[PDB]
């Protein structure tokens, strides 16, 4: 085979798992977009703005491991850049393609369509550097080999988004053919000294500290590290809670697993058991604002292990170049029993979560009855993208069977992230049964993405939330702001059929208003293989978790906090 | 009165003639938002999502000259970063005003939400300073007023946007009170000798080339430059051309106007009257790619007198310091009756612009049909917003009368910026007659700004064009990624409505597939005063302008066009 | 004329006011710098490197009001750059024009010399607009006549240093010919709603505190406001102090002056009466760790009259779009006599500030005595150049005759600034006496632009001071990194003759020695005459020491949490 650039892209693509990439077309990316259409291991797949292009990206990622999306000069990566900085921040390989210029028009005082006015086109690349952990401009074909695989190999180690982009007339230019794909995953070993080391003064750190706690932390799936947990976990007998944003990173039916650990609003029992325990083991952690509930709880200095994906600190002495999954391994094989933080848990007596019972049929339907049945839904298949508001807390309090998986946006938190993202989850992985959790202010910035999975004919269901504003930012600072124009949600998803013609869209809109219409919802949902279906659950503007409640005060006062003296 | 920092900031947008700013609510702001919320004489207004603010504030500055959006940290700013590069390719002055972290947060070792899960906060400033003509991050409240004045000094002199950002914790923190509005608004006049020379030498230019015309740009109106303009091509008396971009930035019912400079797109007769003038002075001009049809038409060096905003190139000098409303008004006083160029074009005998007869009743709509009927609604009194599309090309053939304005984004090109800046525009703008003309594509970007429009009861009137795709792409190269998912577009205006209840909204969507519909259509909604008014214009997908299909070639040669030898 | 890229920079250069640019030669810069000979109003002058060249336009434009520099491709610019940073520290319109890629490599995949290895060339312009107010790239001919008046008049307007870059093969290339010069001087002027306001609540603050010192600041000259001050503390009739980076902003003969305002090291007297002023009208001031003594002398916010460049800020009221000349214009027809802070000042009998008797004329040379003598040769048409160190205060202690400049670097506080800078002052005010006053540490940064001096043929009076070391660092904290490799300093003249050249190189190490160096330095007319100064390391000012405790304890104060 002879490649051009734009094939050897598509081939790089295909040789890191991806079976599909995103795009929005525009004259600067069309024969990029040609080029990469030829390659008969992928599909190409549009989106209707370019911030949802790389939104549902990073939701592929989320399914698949990588993901790429391509979009126009300028107009269209811009915004997108929104998105990277999202994948970004929760660790994701997303390969941002964008068109760029005929490769005549640097040094060449032209004024271009799509740019700023003046005839400089490097500000672009320039932006994208801030918020990538690569970023390369395609000028020549002869370069594009190179350039290609350095941002991809980049990509793949960092777990980072990465950028690029092609002059629009070398797309179908000849250029070198890709080798193997296993090089593409080359990566460094563990030092084996620093693996030996940093395992042998866990041990001696936990030699007198019988009660130890395993705090499971964000980045547990980017150091593909969750099987090697369960593996310590077991072996070490600890009581095992997870950070907020690292819901579904441990098995829940493990009995070691004691629930979620998240300061005032963590389950009955964890505050206590990790005030009191001697030793805690947190697996690739990201201790911020929101995850210490506006830093009132911080760990322990003086307890902590730190076990990162690249590195530990333990015992006072960091150890780079030590991955968590060979740290995990090995501590598994080394570490005796320690049971004592478990021990302390149970002997707590302080139960298990408060859960209401089933809703009377016709009464006004409430948060804690979706939740119900939602958590009802739940299967070994089922993946739950929850988005940015009080949907965050629900998802927390549901009960996991073992596979069931959770997807949370807690470090970017843009809201309307979960509709495009459960679009190109839902796009990476069709045999799940793909549940989205989406308030009605997220919902409305994003929403017209519900109109590919009716394209595409994918069976997701959509939960909207409609209490009637921005309840979270309610509940940390109220005001005008917090209200928005209300809609017919329901009715959106006839809009996104089309002339409604039987061959033009098989979306359903349906309203739940008591525990009854929602029951009757979800079976219509689950019978609808051909689109999907969005279920508008009513509620009372403040008919929210009480952690949302608790958490929003001590992130108002985080937020708020006086300036403290510089001289 | 004592001053905050942030009704510091609302002051200064109200001295420069803001009744409205835009707003999209997050945590940063929420306390900026309130103090902004405490000035009696600004209105703030919400947004559904943060590109859309931007560029609602966009389409305000075309209104009010100027405009402000304010957005959360990080996941408002980036992509609301897309918009103000569009401002900035567009010659508006609009303030980007970020919420940014509490400012005991930098270089403290803290992760923060929004943010890349760095603890390093300075990267949404770099990324500003690329698209904006100042920047400035406001850290204390002693330093609010300075950076404020510098940023909305430099907006107004530059007609470019800028960028403020505003730790989240010091909105309310007092600081000095802001002087006089004419403070800000202080320029440098033009140098006189300068002024002088550059006008005697267009004298000398000219002496012996009795065949001048004038080319009025895109830059005419950042300017402020446009009645100078009618003054000068009176005393001239010679032909007078609008390039594509500058459409109603000239009276189109004077004598001396002979239509739209656009290459082989030219009205009729302009293109021959431009080869065959001796002089042509081009009036604050953009020549890009697309306003020169793809490199095809560029102005001959030979003839060319360059009257840029602040400076000219005449007779092979250039003169900075020469302030085109000044150069123009003096050369309109020093000039003798070059009437030569317009003699010609009516000696060619080239007709008007062919324009089709009305549409059968009963008969499938047509794009000249829509154009005609459109035509016809135009006043004084009018506004038409004219997206990126076909309706570029249906636009530019309409006979203005005196007062009527048409507003592109031809630099930028955005699709889907006309929807939002419909918005901003008419809300700024509340007396005129607001057209918006959007294709099927555009709209899908950014449709749920119409939202903002039924919540504001404006009485917009929107003629979405359903050709079942991107034509304007189909005509430059056609490929799979050309097709979009259609919509019932008509549909869209209930489900903006919301509950339906009387009081919820008053936005009306009708279909529109004959003449007689159309024309019934627009009898509703010039009817309609409390809300928009969405005419779904169904029509054929390759039933386009015929200079849509002659414009897309030379533009597809030119991106194309294959790398030169560069050794 | 015909115009080409390169002539159209030279006749803006000349238009601005140089009759001279700074060069250091390489390829991609070898045709401009022939364009920019073809201008006969202006000479080339060579530097030895680049960050030398940089400094020689600094000091070029304290003399001149503006300076350029052209250098090579990255391995020029990336020194200069440290000049550039200085220059807009010390505001000063510095244009650095460096030579660039072949138009045609940009995007061609070529790897270049002097450049880093890669394909993009990019960089340069992107480091520079960190430090620059204007920086612009030119690739094309029609691109470079708005490039070139754009930085120039940035440069000007703001009283800042900008950059730009020209590619090596268009130089020569034809372009639009520039219009007049005064286009290039078009600055706005005062909103006059706002000057009048501004002058009226001055007035309003002042009517009832008659205690009314001024504090006169280190951006005062790039106010083009020193004139002005006069006229305005003539009318006051109030208490004038000198800010330490504006030493000579104000005639020191004037009766309203009362010395330097800088904390516990000012001038007997002041700081008594800054504390005791009921208003304090500070012009144009900087204020920094370094100017604020560590931050221990800091103006009462409830005191102060803020009138900066563009603006001033008083009774609450910031007014933006007032020029300081014109402010201080107004003011001056307008204010009343407010002596109240004067009076204190005479009042107190603090003297004045305590110096040292003629030293034995065979007594080892004593740091109070050199200082003596230099001040022994102040004239009104003397220039001394101060580099940092204990020369700082050694030239702060001088009383200047009406006319005498001192030029410091304070802001940027590069040592070794002083060599080139010298050299450049002296090429653009070769009327004046040019005294350079530099310590053992510091000449050796830069030491070799004395040799340009010599080839010049300019009458440089260098005093050297040879204290075996780095002693401003010795006085905030010590250790060996400040003890250096002594030089015979004398001897290095003679190096820089050649085999041709009249620098003389002398020692002193009494009184009577210095005596006698110094005529034979008046007399050299035909070159630089430097003076090796021997003194003890700690034989410094008190003032270096108390004031170099308070910087030491500001640097290391702990973080607050
Ligand atoms: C793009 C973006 N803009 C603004 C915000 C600030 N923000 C955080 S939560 C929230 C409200 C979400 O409302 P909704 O989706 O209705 O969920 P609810 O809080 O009502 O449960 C907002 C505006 C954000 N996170 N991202
Ligand atoms: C944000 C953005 N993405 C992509 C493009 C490329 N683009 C230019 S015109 C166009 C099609 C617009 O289609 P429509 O609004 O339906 O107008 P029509 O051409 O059918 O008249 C596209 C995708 C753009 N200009 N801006
Ligand atoms: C380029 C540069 N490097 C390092 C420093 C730090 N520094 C400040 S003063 C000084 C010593 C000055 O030595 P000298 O010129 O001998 O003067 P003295 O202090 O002995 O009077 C040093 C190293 C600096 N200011 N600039
Ligand atoms: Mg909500
Ligand atoms: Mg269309
Ligand atoms: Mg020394």
Same mark, same amino acid.
């Given at each position: 085979?002879d490649?051009?650039?734009?094939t050897?892209?598509?081939?790089?693509?295909?040789?890191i798992?991806?079976?599909?990439?995103?795009?929005?077309?525009?004259?600067?990316? &069309?024969?990029?977009?040609?080029?990469?259409?030829?390659?008969?291991?992928?599909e190409?797949?549009?989106?209707?703005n370019?911030?949802?292009?790389?939104?549902?990206?990073?939701?592929?990622?989320?399914?698949?491991?990588?993901?790429?999306?391509?979009?126009?000069?300028?107009?269209?990566?811009?915004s997108?850049?929104?998105?990277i900085?999202?994948?970004?921040?929760?660790?994701?390989?997303?390969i941002?393609?964008?068109?760029?210029?005929n490769?005549?028009?640097?040094?060449?005082?032209?004024?271009?369509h799509?740019?700023?006015?003046?005839?400089?086109?490097?500000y672009?690349? /320039?932006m994208?550097?801030?918020?990538?952990?690569a970023?390369?401009?395609?000028?020549?074909?002869?370069?594009?080999?190179?350039?290609?695989?350095h941002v991809?190999?980049?990509?793949?180690?960092?777990?980072?988004?990465?950028?690029?982009?092609?002059?629009?007339?070398?797309?179908?230019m000849?250029?070198?053919?890709?080798?193997?794909?296993?090089?593409?995953?080359?990566?460094?070993?563990s030092?084996?000294?620093?693996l030996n080391?940093a395992?042998?003064?866990?041990?001696?750190?936990i030699?007198?500290?019988?009660?130890?706690?395993?705090?499971?932390?964000?980045?547990?799936?980017?150091?593909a590290?969750?099987?090697?947990?369960v593996?310590?976990?077991?072996?070490?007998?600890?009581?095992?809670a997870?950070?907020?944003?690292?819901?579904?990173?441990?098995?829940?039916?493990?009995?070691?697993?004691?629930?979620?650990?998240?300061?005032?609003? *963590?389950?009955?029992?964890? /505050?206590?058991?990790?005030?009191?325990?001697?030793?805690?083991?947190?697996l690739?952690?990201?201790?911020?604002?929101? *995850?210490?509930?506006?830093?009132?709880?911080?760990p322990?200095?003086?307890?902590?292990?730190?076990?990162?994906?690249?590195?530990?600190?333990?015992?006072?002495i960091r150890?780079?170049?030590?991955?968590?999954?060979?740290?995990?391994?090995?501590?598994?094989?080394?570490?005796?029993?320690?049971?004592?933080?478990?021990?302390?848990?149970?002997?707590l007596?302080?139960?298990?979560?408060?859960?209401?019972?089933?809703?009377?049929?016709?009464?006004?339907?409430?948060?804690? /009855?979706?939740?119900?049945?939602i958590?009802?839904?739940?299967?070994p298949?089922?993946?739950?993208?929850?988005?940015?508001?009080?949907?965050?807390?629900?998802?927390?309090?549901?009960?996991?069977?073992?596979?069931?998986?959770?997807?949370?946006?807690?470090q970017?938190?843009?809201?309307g992230?979960?509709?495009?993202?459960?679009?190109?989850?839902?796009?990476?992985?069709?045999?799940?049964?793909?549940?989205?959790?989406?308030?009605?202010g997220?919902?409305?910035?994003?929403?017209?993405?519900?109109?590919?999975?009716v394209?595409?004919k994918?069976?997701?269901?959509?939960?909207?939330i409609?209490?009637?504003?921005?309840?979270?930012?309610?509940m940390?600072?109220?005001?005008?702001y917090?209200?928005?124009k209300?809609?017919?949600?329901?009715?959106?998803?006839?809009?996104?059929?089309?002339?409604?013609?039987?061959?033009?869209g098989?979306?359903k809109?349906?309203?739940?208003?008591?525990?009854?219409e929602?029951?009757?919802?979800?079976?219509?949902?689950?019978?609808?293989?051909?689109?999907?279906?969005?279920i508008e659950?009513?509620?009372?503007?403040?008919?929210?978790?009480?952690? &949302?409640?608790?958490?929003?005060?001590?992130?108002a006062?985080?937020?708020?906090?006086?300036?403290?003296?510089?001289?």
């Open positions: 085979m490649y051009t650039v734009g050897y892209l598509a081939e790089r693509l295909v040789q798992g991806l079976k599909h990439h995103f795009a929005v077309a525009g004259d600067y990316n &069309l024969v990029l977009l040609d080029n990469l259409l030829d390659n008969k291991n992928m190409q797949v549009y989106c209707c370019e911030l949802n292009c790389g939104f549902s990206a990073e939701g592929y990622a989320r399914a698949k491991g990588a993901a790429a999306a391509v979009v126009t000069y300028s107009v269209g990566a811009l997108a850049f929104d998105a900085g999202g994948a970004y921040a929760e660790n994701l390989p997303v941002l393609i964008s068109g760029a210029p490769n005549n028009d640097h040094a060449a005082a032209h004024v271009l799509h740019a700023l006015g003046k005839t400089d086109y490097h672009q690349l /320039e994208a550097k801030n918020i990538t952990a970023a390369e401009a395609i000028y020549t074909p002869e370069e594009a080999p190179a350039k290609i695989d991809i190999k980049t990509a793949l180690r960092e777990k980072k988004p990465v950028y690029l982009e092609i002059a629009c007339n070398i797309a179908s000849p250029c070198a053919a890709p080798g193997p794909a296993s090089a593409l995953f080359n990566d460094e070993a030092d084996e000294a620093s080391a395992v042998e003064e866990t041990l001696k750190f030699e007198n500290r019988d009660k130890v706690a395993v705090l499971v932390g964000s980045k547990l799936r980017a150091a590290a969750e099987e090697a947990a593996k310590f976990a077991d072996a070490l007998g600890g009581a095992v997870t950070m907020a944003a690292a819901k579904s990173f441990f098995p829940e039916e493990n009995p070691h697993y004691i629930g979620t650990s998240w300061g005032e609003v *963590s389950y009955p029992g964890v /505050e206590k058991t990790m005030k009191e325990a001697d030793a805690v083991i947190a690739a952690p990201v201790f911020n604002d929101y *995850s210490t509930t506006g830093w009132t709880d911080i322990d200095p003086k307890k902590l292990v730190l076990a990162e994906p690249r590195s530990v600190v333990v015992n006072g150890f780079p170049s030590v991955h968590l999954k060979d740290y995990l391994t090995r501590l598994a094989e080394k570490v005796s029993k320690k049971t004592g933080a478990l021990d302390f848990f149970k002997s007596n302080a139960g298990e979560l408060k859960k209401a019972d089933p809703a009377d049929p016709s009464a006004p339907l409430v948060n804690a /009855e979706i939740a119900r049945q958590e009802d839904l739940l299967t298949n089922t993946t739950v993208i929850a988005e940015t508001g009080d949907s965050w807390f629900n998802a927390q309090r549901m009960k996991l069977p073992n596979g069931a998986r959770v997807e949370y946006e807690m970017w938190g843009h809201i992230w979960s509709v495009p993202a459960a679009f190109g989850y839902a796009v990476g992985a069709p045999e799940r049964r793909n549940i989205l959790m989406v308030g009605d997220s919902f409305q910035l994003t929403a017209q993405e519900v109109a590919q999975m394209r595409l994918l069976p997701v269901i959509i939960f909207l409609n209490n009637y504003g921005y309840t979270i930012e309610v940390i600072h109220d005001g005008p917090n209200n928005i209300n809609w017919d949600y329901a009715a959106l998803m006839e809009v996104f059929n089309g002339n409604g013609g039987y061959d033009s098989a979306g809109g349906l309203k739940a208003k008591t525990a009854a929602l029951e009757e919802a979800i079976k219509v949902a689950l019978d609808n293989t051909d689109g999907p279906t969005l659950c009513f509620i009372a503007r403040e008919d929210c978790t009480e952690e &949302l409640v608790k958490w929003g005060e001590r992130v006062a985080a937020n708020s906090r006086k300036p403290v003296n510089k001289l």
